[PDB]
Amino acid sequence: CPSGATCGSYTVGGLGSRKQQVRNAGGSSLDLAVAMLETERMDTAYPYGDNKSGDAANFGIFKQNWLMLRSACAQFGGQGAGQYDNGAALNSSLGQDVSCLHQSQSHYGLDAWFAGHRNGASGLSSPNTADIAAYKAAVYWIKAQLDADSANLGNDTRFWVQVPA
Ligand SMILES: [Cl-]
Numbered sequence: 001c002p003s004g005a006t007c008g009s010y011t012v013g014g015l016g017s018r019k020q021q022v023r024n025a026g027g028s029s030l031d032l033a034v035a036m037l038e039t040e041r042m043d044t045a046y047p048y049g050d051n052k053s054g055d056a057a058n059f060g061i062f063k064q065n066w067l068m069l070r071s072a073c074a075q076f077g078g079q080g081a082g083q084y085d086n087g088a089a090l091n092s093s094l095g096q097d098v099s100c101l102h103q104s105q106s107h108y109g110l111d112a113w114f115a116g117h118r119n120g121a122s123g124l125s126s127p128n129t130a131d132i133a134a135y136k137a138a139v140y141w142i143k144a145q146l147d148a149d150s151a152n153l154g155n156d157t158r159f160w161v162q163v164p165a
Pocket of ligand 1: 063064065068069104116117118
């Protein structure tokens, strides 16, 4: 486990089939790690926008925020913060979700992407915080578990890390 955190793994029914769908939609192991951290079932069943509005609203299985989406992704080009409900298109289309993730990561580079993903504009402007570093470490710990045994790319196991610890 990273730092002083608890971590572990448990079984989620149907998750292996879902992992395969994410991969077939273009998700890499890093993308799977992010998805695995963000929701239990790699879905969009969390509250709409993750109970946030505007630039802070989250959409899709990676919980991408509207600032990131409208700043980097062609389908949201030129849109303002108040148009955030348009990001809900990612809740219905896994292919668009992955496409947007890749556009955003390429636009910012991965290091900046982690910062903006975690903390929005504040994160992009101050990307080297301890909290952002903890988030990144959690994702890469999950990825290490996926990398260490390829069965984890298609089985029902969810790896988890308590990011606040
Ligand atoms: Cl994001």
